[PDB]
PDB file of C-alpha atoms in Angstrom:
ATOM      1  CA  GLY A   1      88.783  78.796 103.300  1.00 58.41           C
ATOM      2  CA  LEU A   2      87.937  81.449 100.671  1.00 58.45           C
ATOM      3  CA  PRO A   3      86.501  84.818 101.863  1.00 60.14           C
ATOM      4  CA  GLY A   4      83.173  85.541 100.161  1.00 61.18           C
ATOM      5  CA  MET A   5      82.635  81.963  99.064  1.00 58.99           C
ATOM      6  CA  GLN A   6      78.915  81.640  98.425  1.00 63.32           C
ATOM      7  CA  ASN A   7      76.657  78.704  99.202  1.00 62.11           C
ATOM      8  CA  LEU A   8      78.029  75.772  97.231  1.00 63.55           C
ATOM      9  CA  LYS A   9      74.448  75.094  96.097  1.00 64.55           C
ATOM     10  CA  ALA A  10      74.178  78.574  94.604  1.00 62.21           C
ATOM     11  CA  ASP A  11      74.511  77.974  90.860  1.00 59.76           C
ATOM     12  CA  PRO A  12      76.403  81.019  89.570  1.00 61.38           C
ATOM     13  CA  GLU A  13      75.060  79.996  86.191  1.00 58.10           C
ATOM     14  CA  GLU A  14      71.656  80.674  87.724  1.00 60.76           C
ATOM     15  CA  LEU A  15      72.683  83.896  89.423  1.00 59.29           C
ATOM     16  CA  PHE A  16      74.609  85.450  86.526  1.00 61.53           C
ATOM     17  CA  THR A  17      74.266  85.756  82.768  1.00 60.97           C
ATOM     18  CA  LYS A  18      77.809  85.316  81.346  1.00 63.14           C
ATOM     19  CA  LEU A  19      78.648  87.448  78.345  1.00 65.18           C
ATOM     20  CA  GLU A  20      81.816  88.326  76.334  1.00 64.61           C
ATOM     21  CA  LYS A  21      85.483  88.051  77.319  1.00 64.56           C
ATOM     22  CA  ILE A  22      87.029  91.320  78.490  1.00 61.85           C
ATOM     23  CA  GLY A  23      90.442  90.552  80.033  1.00 63.31           C
ATOM     24  CA  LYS A  24      92.726  88.284  82.110  1.00 65.88           C
ATOM     25  CA  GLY A  25      94.088  88.035  85.648  1.00 67.64           C
ATOM     26  CA  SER A  26      96.947  86.101  87.205  1.00 65.46           C
ATOM     27  CA  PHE A  27      94.899  82.943  87.009  1.00 67.43           C
ATOM     28  CA  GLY A  28      91.954  82.919  84.533  1.00 68.94           C
ATOM     29  CA  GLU A  29      89.714  84.533  81.852  1.00 71.47           C
ATOM     30  CA  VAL A  30      87.405  87.493  82.607  1.00 68.05           C
ATOM     31  CA  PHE A  31      83.999  88.019  81.241  1.00 66.22           C
ATOM     32  CA  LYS A  32      81.458  90.779  81.401  1.00 65.44           C
ATOM     33  CA  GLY A  33      78.329  89.433  83.044  1.00 67.16           C
ATOM     34  CA  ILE A  34      74.942  90.480  84.360  1.00 63.74           C
ATOM     35  CA  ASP A  35      73.738  89.854  87.941  1.00 68.46           C
ATOM     36  CA  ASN A  36      70.322  88.285  87.170  1.00 70.15           C
ATOM     37  CA  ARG A  37      68.715  89.598  90.394  1.00 69.19           C
ATOM     38  CA  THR A  38      69.771  93.289  90.218  1.00 66.13           C
ATOM     39  CA  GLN A  39      70.584  93.541  86.475  1.00 67.89           C
ATOM     40  CA  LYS A  40      73.888  95.293  87.335  1.00 66.29           C
ATOM     41  CA  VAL A  41      76.808  94.498  85.099  1.00 65.66           C
ATOM     42  CA  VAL A  42      79.699  92.698  86.816  1.00 68.40           C
ATOM     43  CA  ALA A  43      83.086  91.352  85.842  1.00 65.99           C
ATOM     44  CA  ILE A  44      83.392  87.595  86.309  1.00 66.36           C
ATOM     45  CA  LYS A  45      86.792  85.923  86.470  1.00 65.86           C
ATOM     46  CA  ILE A  46      86.557  82.182  85.889  1.00 64.63           C
ATOM     47  CA  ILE A  47      89.385  79.922  87.093  1.00 65.21           C
ATOM     48  CA  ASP A  48      89.607  76.142  86.364  1.00 64.50           C
ATOM     49  CA  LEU A  49      90.770  74.589  89.641  1.00 64.75           C
ATOM     50  CA  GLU A  50      91.313  71.142  88.102  1.00 67.52           C
ATOM     51  CA  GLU A  51      93.822  73.024  85.946  1.00 67.36           C
ATOM     52  CA  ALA A  52      95.440  74.933  88.770  1.00 67.36           C
ATOM     53  CA  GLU A  53      98.079  73.454  91.025  1.00 70.88           C
ATOM     54  CA  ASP A  54     100.492  75.159  93.366  1.00 73.20           C
ATOM     55  CA  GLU A  55      98.667  78.371  92.387  1.00 73.45           C
ATOM     56  CA  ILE A  56      95.435  77.810  94.256  1.00 73.46           C
ATOM     57  CA  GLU A  57      97.116  79.236  97.376  1.00 73.57           C
ATOM     58  CA  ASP A  58      97.779  82.337  95.185  1.00 70.67           C
ATOM     59  CA  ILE A  59      94.206  82.594  94.018  1.00 71.71           C
ATOM     60  CA  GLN A  60      93.230  82.251  97.645  1.00 71.44           C
ATOM     61  CA  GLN A  61      95.500  85.079  98.719  1.00 70.88           C
ATOM     62  CA  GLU A  62      94.263  87.304  95.785  1.00 70.77           C
ATOM     63  CA  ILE A  63      90.691  86.928  96.889  1.00 69.12           C
ATOM     64  CA  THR A  64      91.513  87.414 100.600  1.00 68.29           C
ATOM     65  CA  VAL A  65      93.394  90.665  99.937  1.00 69.76           C
ATOM     66  CA  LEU A  66      90.582  91.901  97.666  1.00 71.72           C
ATOM     67  CA  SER A  67      87.954  91.001 100.237  1.00 73.99           C
ATOM     68  CA  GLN A  68      89.770  93.131 102.836  1.00 72.62           C
ATOM     69  CA  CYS A  69      89.748  96.296 100.737  1.00 72.03           C
ATOM     70  CA  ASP A  70      86.933  98.862 100.836  1.00 68.87           C
ATOM     71  CA  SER A  71      87.893 101.887  98.827  1.00 68.31           C
ATOM     72  CA  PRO A  72      86.479 104.020  95.963  1.00 69.08           C
ATOM     73  CA  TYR A  73      89.947 103.394  94.376  1.00 69.67           C
ATOM     74  CA  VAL A  74      90.135  99.648  94.427  1.00 71.47           C
ATOM     75  CA  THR A  75      87.911  97.261  92.361  1.00 71.80           C
ATOM     76  CA  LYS A  76      85.273  95.691  94.622  1.00 72.16           C
ATOM     77  CA  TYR A  77      84.855  91.984  95.250  1.00 73.97           C
ATOM     78  CA  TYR A  78      81.268  90.666  95.471  1.00 73.07           C
ATOM     79  CA  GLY A  79      81.890  86.995  96.271  1.00 73.11           C
ATOM     80  CA  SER A  80      82.926  83.633  94.811  1.00 74.58           C
ATOM     81  CA  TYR A  81      81.009  80.577  93.535  1.00 78.21           C
ATOM     82  CA  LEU A  82      82.208  77.085  92.707  1.00 75.72           C
ATOM     83  CA  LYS A  83      80.617  75.368  89.729  1.00 77.26           C
ATOM     84  CA  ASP A  84      81.855  71.858  89.183  1.00 80.02           C
ATOM     85  CA  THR A  85      85.593  72.471  88.751  1.00 78.58           C
ATOM     86  CA  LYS A  86      85.396  76.185  87.996  1.00 80.32           C
ATOM     87  CA  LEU A  87      85.647  79.034  90.463  1.00 81.69           C
ATOM     88  CA  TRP A  88      83.536  82.162  89.533  1.00 79.96           C
ATOM     89  CA  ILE A  89      84.922  85.290  91.142  1.00 84.15           C
ATOM     90  CA  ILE A  90      82.436  88.230  90.934  1.00 83.39           C
ATOM     91  CA  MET A  91      84.003  91.672  90.693  1.00 83.03           C
ATOM     92  CA  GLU A  92      83.084  95.289  90.053  1.00 83.65           C
ATOM     93  CA  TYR A  93      82.656  96.086  86.376  1.00 87.53           C
ATOM     94  CA  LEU A  94      84.469  99.222  85.079  1.00 83.26           C
ATOM     95  CA  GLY A  95      83.106 100.099  81.676  1.00 82.69           C
ATOM     96  CA  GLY A  96      85.573 102.792  80.671  1.00 87.74           C
ATOM     97  CA  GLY A  97      88.363 100.330  79.890  1.00 88.40           C
ATOM     98  CA  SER A  98      91.926 100.405  81.157  1.00 89.38           C
ATOM     99  CA  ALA A  99      94.291 103.294  80.901  1.00 88.23           C
ATOM    100  CA  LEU A 100      96.303 101.202  78.443  1.00 92.24           C
ATOM    101  CA  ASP A 101      93.224 100.929  76.160  1.00 93.73           C
ATOM    102  CA  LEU A 102      92.693 104.655  76.335  1.00 94.99           C
ATOM    103  CA  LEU A 103      96.162 105.198  74.918  1.00 95.40           C
ATOM    104  CA  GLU A 104      95.317 103.301  71.678  1.00 97.64           C
ATOM    105  CA  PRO A 105      93.874 106.354  69.817  1.00 95.96           C
ATOM    106  CA  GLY A 106      96.834 108.635  70.519  1.00 91.23           C
ATOM    107  CA  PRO A 107      98.826 110.201  73.324  1.00 89.90           C
ATOM    108  CA  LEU A 108      97.385 111.580  76.493  1.00 92.80           C
ATOM    109  CA  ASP A 109      97.964 115.244  77.501  1.00 93.00           C
ATOM    110  CA  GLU A 110      99.530 116.148  80.804  1.00 92.69           C
ATOM    111  CA  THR A 111      96.203 117.054  82.486  1.00 95.27           C
ATOM    112  CA  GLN A 112      94.986 113.505  81.652  1.00 97.85           C
ATOM    113  CA  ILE A 113      98.287 111.942  82.873  1.00 94.96           C
ATOM    114  CA  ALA A 114      98.237 113.967  86.116  1.00 89.70           C
ATOM    115  CA  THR A 115      94.540 113.149  86.744  1.00 91.45           C
ATOM    116  CA  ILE A 116      95.108 109.404  86.298  1.00 92.49           C
ATOM    117  CA  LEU A 117      98.286 109.375  88.385  1.00 93.69           C
ATOM    118  CA  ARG A 118      96.501 111.327  91.146  1.00 96.75           C
ATOM    119  CA  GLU A 119      93.800 108.686  91.376  1.00 95.94           C
ATOM    120  CA  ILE A 120      96.277 105.811  91.248  1.00 98.35           C
ATOM    121  CA  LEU A 121      98.051 107.577  94.178  1.00 96.90           C
ATOM    122  CA  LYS A 122      94.773 107.731  96.139  1.00 97.08           C
ATOM    123  CA  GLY A 123      94.476 103.939  95.676  1.00 98.76           C
ATOM    124  CA  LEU A 124      98.087 103.308  96.669  1.00 96.99           C
ATOM    125  CA  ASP A 125      97.750 105.632  99.713  1.00 96.81           C
ATOM    126  CA  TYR A 126      94.778 103.523 100.760  1.00100.75           C
ATOM    127  CA  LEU A 127      96.538 100.167 100.189  1.00 99.07           C
ATOM    128  CA  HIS A 128      99.766 101.293 101.874  1.00101.70           C
ATOM    129  CA  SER A 129      97.842 102.663 104.903  1.00 99.08           C
ATOM    130  CA  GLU A 130      96.286  99.151 105.153  1.00 98.54           C
ATOM    131  CA  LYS A 131      99.718  97.448 105.016  1.00 98.22           C
ATOM    132  CA  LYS A 132      99.098  96.063 101.575  1.00101.46           C
ATOM    133  CA  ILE A 133     101.271  96.270  98.453  1.00101.40           C
ATOM    134  CA  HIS A 134      99.678  96.083  95.002  1.00 99.98           C
ATOM    135  CA  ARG A 135     102.802  94.650  93.225  1.00102.90           C
ATOM    136  CA  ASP A 136     101.443  94.944  89.698  1.00104.47           C
ATOM    137  CA  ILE A 137     100.841  98.675  89.021  1.00105.65           C
ATOM    138  CA  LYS A 138     100.834  99.252  85.222  1.00104.12           C
ATOM    139  CA  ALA A 139      98.435 100.934  82.820  1.00103.94           C
ATOM    140  CA  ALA A 140      96.603  97.704  81.997  1.00102.56           C
ATOM    141  CA  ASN A 141      95.646  97.368  85.672  1.00103.24           C
ATOM    142  CA  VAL A 142      94.326 100.960  86.081  1.00 99.84           C
ATOM    143  CA  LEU A 143      90.664 100.825  85.119  1.00100.71           C
ATOM    144  CA  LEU A 144      88.087 103.501  84.488  1.00101.49           C
ATOM    145  CA  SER A 145      84.345 103.523  85.071  1.00102.75           C
ATOM    146  CA  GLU A 146      82.074 104.952  82.382  1.00106.44           C
ATOM    147  CA  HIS A 147      81.991 108.144  84.538  1.00109.07           C
ATOM    148  CA  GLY A 148      85.784 108.547  84.433  1.00114.18           C
ATOM    149  CA  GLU A 149      86.439 107.192  87.949  1.00113.78           C
ATOM    150  CA  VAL A 150      89.890 105.536  88.188  1.00112.20           C
ATOM    151  CA  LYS A 151      90.472 102.318  90.148  1.00112.47           C
ATOM    152  CA  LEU A 152      93.235  99.784  90.735  1.00115.90           C
ATOM    153  CA  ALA A 153      92.604  96.226  89.625  1.00113.60           C
ATOM    154  CA  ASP A 154      94.251  92.831  89.584  1.00111.49           C
ATOM    155  CA  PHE A 155      95.597  91.723  92.879  1.00110.85           C
ATOM    156  CA  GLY A 156      96.849  88.360  91.694  1.00113.30           C
ATOM    157  CA  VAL A 157     100.279  89.073  93.145  1.00115.29           C
ATOM    158  CA  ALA A 158      99.287  91.471  95.960  1.00115.46           C
ATOM    159  CA  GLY A 159     101.182  91.277  99.238  1.00116.03           C
ATOM    160  CA  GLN A 160     100.376  91.809 102.893  1.00114.83           C
ATOM    161  CA  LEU A 161     102.786  93.186 105.541  1.00115.42           C
ATOM    162  CA  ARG A 162     108.733  90.771 101.569  1.00116.86           C
ATOM    163  CA  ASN A 163     111.252  89.290  99.091  1.00119.14           C
ATOM    164  CA  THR A 164     109.087  87.221  96.668  1.00120.10           C
ATOM    165  CA  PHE A 165     109.903  87.654  92.965  1.00120.49           C
ATOM    166  CA  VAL A 166     106.487  88.777  91.562  1.00120.60           C
ATOM    167  CA  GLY A 167     105.210  91.397  89.092  1.00120.78           C
ATOM    168  CA  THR A 168     105.407  92.092  85.322  1.00122.33           C
ATOM    169  CA  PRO A 169     109.119  92.523  84.523  1.00123.54           C
ATOM    170  CA  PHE A 170     109.113  95.924  82.843  1.00123.76           C
ATOM    171  CA  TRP A 171     107.333  97.497  85.879  1.00123.77           C
ATOM    172  CA  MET A 172     109.253  95.659  88.670  1.00124.10           C
ATOM    173  CA  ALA A 173     111.448  97.566  91.110  1.00126.17           C
ATOM    174  CA  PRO A 174     115.174  96.617  91.254  1.00127.81           C
ATOM    175  CA  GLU A 175     114.832  95.247  94.805  1.00126.20           C
ATOM    176  CA  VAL A 176     111.849  93.043  93.763  1.00127.85           C
ATOM    177  CA  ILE A 177     113.853  91.525  90.903  1.00128.34           C
ATOM    178  CA  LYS A 178     116.950  90.965  93.129  1.00130.38           C
ATOM    179  CA  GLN A 179     114.620  89.420  95.782  1.00130.88           C
ATOM    180  CA  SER A 180     115.848  91.820  98.473  1.00131.57           C
ATOM    181  CA  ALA A 181     113.639  92.859 101.380  1.00131.97           C
ATOM    182  CA  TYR A 182     110.973  95.192  99.967  1.00134.38           C
ATOM    183  CA  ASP A 183     107.812  97.054 100.911  1.00131.19           C
ATOM    184  CA  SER A 184     105.318  99.655  99.630  1.00132.56           C
ATOM    185  CA  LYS A 185     108.139 101.572  97.966  1.00129.67           C
ATOM    186  CA  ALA A 186     108.218  98.935  95.257  1.00129.82           C
ATOM    187  CA  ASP A 187     104.739 100.129  94.172  1.00133.35           C
ATOM    188  CA  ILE A 188     106.194 103.716  93.979  1.00134.29           C
ATOM    189  CA  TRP A 189     108.855 102.564  91.534  1.00132.37           C
ATOM    190  CA  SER A 190     106.124 100.766  89.462  1.00132.77           C
ATOM    191  CA  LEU A 191     104.123 104.046  89.530  1.00131.15           C
ATOM    192  CA  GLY A 192     107.119 105.826  88.001  1.00131.94           C
ATOM    193  CA  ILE A 193     107.275 103.228  85.229  1.00130.92           C
ATOM    194  CA  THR A 194     103.491 103.661  84.750  1.00132.19           C
ATOM    195  CA  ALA A 195     103.972 107.433  84.481  1.00133.39           C
ATOM    196  CA  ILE A 196     106.453 106.806  81.638  1.00130.12           C
ATOM    197  CA  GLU A 197     103.900 104.413  80.070  1.00133.95           C
ATOM    198  CA  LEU A 198     101.082 106.972  80.321  1.00134.22           C
ATOM    199  CA  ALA A 199     103.329 109.615  78.658  1.00136.67           C
ATOM    200  CA  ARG A 200     104.985 107.517  75.967  1.00138.88           C
ATOM    201  CA  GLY A 201     102.627 104.617  75.554  1.00138.16           C
ATOM    202  CA  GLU A 202     105.076 101.890  76.655  1.00137.78           C
ATOM    203  CA  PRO A 203     107.411 101.279  79.614  1.00139.85           C
ATOM    204  CA  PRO A 204     111.216 101.487  79.304  1.00142.77           C
ATOM    205  CA  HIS A 205     112.794  98.465  77.546  1.00143.14           C
ATOM    206  CA  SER A 206     109.471  97.510  75.985  1.00142.04           C
ATOM    207  CA  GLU A 207     111.047  96.225  72.827  1.00142.97           C
ATOM    208  CA  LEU A 208     113.505  93.955  74.583  1.00145.10           C
ATOM    209  CA  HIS A 209     113.218  90.336  75.611  1.00145.58           C
ATOM    210  CA  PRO A 210     112.039  90.174  79.226  1.00147.23           C
ATOM    211  CA  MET A 211     115.101  88.141  80.147  1.00143.97           C
ATOM    212  CA  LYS A 212     117.387  91.031  79.141  1.00145.93           C
ATOM    213  CA  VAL A 213     115.124  93.262  81.157  1.00146.12           C
ATOM    214  CA  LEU A 214     115.970  91.086  84.262  1.00148.32           C
ATOM    215  CA  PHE A 215     119.594  92.077  84.345  1.00151.99           C
ATOM    216  CA  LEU A 216     119.204  95.631  82.950  1.00148.76           C
ATOM    217  CA  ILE A 217     116.932  96.886  85.698  1.00146.50           C
ATOM    218  CA  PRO A 218     119.320  96.174  88.586  1.00147.29           C
ATOM    219  CA  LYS A 219     122.410  97.196  86.556  1.00147.47           C
ATOM    220  CA  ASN A 220     121.404 100.385  84.780  1.00146.65           C
ATOM    221  CA  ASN A 221     120.831 103.811  86.225  1.00147.27           C
ATOM    222  CA  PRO A 222     117.062 104.164  86.540  1.00147.49           C
ATOM    223  CA  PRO A 223     115.006 105.170  83.478  1.00147.62           C
ATOM    224  CA  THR A 224     114.083 108.777  82.940  1.00147.78           C
ATOM    225  CA  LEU A 225     111.243 110.221  80.894  1.00146.01           C
ATOM    226  CA  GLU A 226     112.591 111.287  77.500  1.00144.90           C
ATOM    227  CA  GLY A 227     110.847 113.719  75.227  1.00144.40           C
ATOM    228  CA  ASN A 228     109.216 117.098  75.330  1.00144.35           C
ATOM    229  CA  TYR A 229     107.388 116.750  78.602  1.00144.77           C
ATOM    230  CA  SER A 230     107.178 119.269  81.411  1.00144.98           C
ATOM    231  CA  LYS A 231     109.883 119.521  83.948  1.00147.31           C
ATOM    232  CA  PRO A 232     107.367 118.720  86.768  1.00149.52           C
ATOM    233  CA  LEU A 233     106.363 115.493  84.974  1.00148.49           C
ATOM    234  CA  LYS A 234     109.997 114.482  84.382  1.00148.74           C
ATOM    235  CA  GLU A 235     110.738 115.212  88.100  1.00148.10           C
ATOM    236  CA  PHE A 236     107.721 113.189  89.260  1.00150.00           C
ATOM    237  CA  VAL A 237     109.131 110.250  87.264  1.00148.85           C
ATOM    238  CA  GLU A 238     112.618 110.751  88.727  1.00147.71           C
ATOM    239  CA  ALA A 239     111.273 110.949  92.277  1.00145.44           C
ATOM    240  CA  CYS A 240     109.641 107.555  91.864  1.00146.14           C
ATOM    241  CA  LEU A 241     112.472 105.954  89.931  1.00146.15           C
ATOM    242  CA  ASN A 242     115.346 106.105  92.419  1.00150.36           C
ATOM    243  CA  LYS A 243     117.239 102.879  92.938  1.00149.22           C
ATOM    244  CA  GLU A 244     117.271 103.470  96.737  1.00150.11           C
ATOM    245  CA  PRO A 245     113.756 102.726  97.997  1.00151.73           C
ATOM    246  CA  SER A 246     114.107 104.988 100.981  1.00150.92           C
ATOM    247  CA  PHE A 247     114.739 107.862  98.593  1.00152.20           C
ATOM    248  CA  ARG A 248     111.362 107.376  96.813  1.00149.72           C
ATOM    249  CA  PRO A 249     108.534 109.444  98.319  1.00149.08           C
ATOM    250  CA  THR A 250     105.392 107.918  99.826  1.00150.31           C
ATOM    251  CA  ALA A 251     102.085 108.000  97.886  1.00149.98           C
ATOM    252  CA  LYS A 252     100.710 110.524 100.355  1.00149.14           C
ATOM    253  CA  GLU A 253     103.631 112.832  99.618  1.00149.29           C
ATOM    254  CA  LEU A 254     103.296 112.405  95.842  1.00151.28           C
ATOM    255  CA  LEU A 255      99.640 113.534  96.022  1.00148.73           C
ATOM    256  CA  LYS A 256     101.101 116.990  96.788  1.00147.83           C
ATOM    257  CA  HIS A 257     103.739 116.922  94.042  1.00149.10           C
ATOM    258  CA  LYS A 258     103.775 120.014  91.850  1.00146.84           C
ATOM    259  CA  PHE A 259     103.096 117.939  88.749  1.00147.68           C
ATOM    260  CA  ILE A 260      99.836 116.689  90.268  1.00150.50           C
ATOM    261  CA  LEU A 261      98.774 119.989  91.798  1.00151.47           C
ATOM    262  CA  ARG A 262      99.450 122.115  88.676  1.00151.24           C
ATOM    263  CA  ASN A 263      97.916 119.696  86.193  1.00147.99           C
ATOM    264  CA  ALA A 264      95.269 117.298  87.591  1.00149.66           C
ATOM    265  CA  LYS A 265      91.620 118.164  87.103  1.00150.94           C
ATOM    266  CA  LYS A 266      88.319 116.490  87.950  1.00153.19           C
ATOM    267  CA  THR A 267      87.930 112.853  86.942  1.00153.97           C
ATOM    268  CA  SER A 268      84.671 113.594  85.112  1.00153.59           C
ATOM    269  CA  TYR A 269      86.767 115.121  82.332  1.00152.46           C
ATOM    270  CA  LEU A 270      88.190 111.642  81.597  1.00153.10           C
ATOM    271  CA  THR A 271      84.949 110.752  79.915  1.00150.08           C
ATOM    272  CA  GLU A 272      86.449 112.641  76.958  1.00153.50           C
ATOM    273  CA  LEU A 273      89.171 110.075  76.851  1.00150.87           C
ATOM    274  CA  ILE A 274      86.657 107.242  77.062  1.00149.25           C
ATOM    275  CA  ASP A 275      84.621 108.861  74.182  1.00149.04           C
ATOM    276  CA  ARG A 276      87.761 109.219  72.118  1.00146.92           C
ATOM    277  CA  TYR A 277      88.403 105.471  72.492  1.00149.50           C
ATOM    278  CA  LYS A 278      84.828 104.609  71.646  1.00149.17           C
ATOM    279  CA  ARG A 279      84.891 106.738  68.494  1.00149.33           C
ATOM    280  CA  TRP A 280      88.269 105.232  67.534  1.00147.64           C
ATOM    281  CA  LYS A 281      87.227 101.638  68.193  1.00147.19           C
ATOM    282  CA  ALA A 282      83.986 102.334  66.280  1.00146.00           C
ATOM    283  CA  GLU A 283      85.956 102.925  63.154  1.00147.88           C
ATOM    284  CA  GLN A 284      88.867 100.501  62.990  1.00146.49           C
TER     285      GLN A 284
END
């Protein structure tokens, strides 16, 4: 059945202290929680199975893919518990917030953008080397630890090596929307959209109805990064955002792109970004 499923007599309400809401996945609410035995903080996604239907197979695939990953760049999975009709999925807690949150106080600079993209690329290199496709790369799914470590989250639509129509519209590759045969290169296109999001704060077409977005992506020339950004950053975006998937580089190649090499710095410096968000949120 479900990888990591714990003893059905384990009462997750006994094993964990459930605290405030912090986010949402493909299928449920997420709460910060405390493991009552170790006192480590965890993220707990709770899904109501009585409420699910013709999705359960999806939840099952999310958890299986997650359970198969073991990387410093992918959120860890600690197991699942069933309580009455609710499934408790225990995940790694990343206290820094998502990259999208970190944009709330103001723009990022190019060292911050390059550092975050570099770590996303380490996670995609890992997933692609394992024949997995993330399928939902976007700033909201790039999470930071309180130390500035950057990890990929939310595998609700993750694939395993496709032509299934999945993803969040604004970040979907043209071939994913047209339901053509696709692979890891679709994540490279989403990375290019995420690079635009990290530079500008929103993805292309963000103010349009998602249904318009469905015909504009396959029809229009690909987006480019507009504004006063460096030529290496604009070229990194263009490399990723080619309509021909075979013309997009691999993640391993992008780790050596001049934008990354000339601008990325250690991840520990991202704690400045996390502090900025904390100070900002503290006022508000």
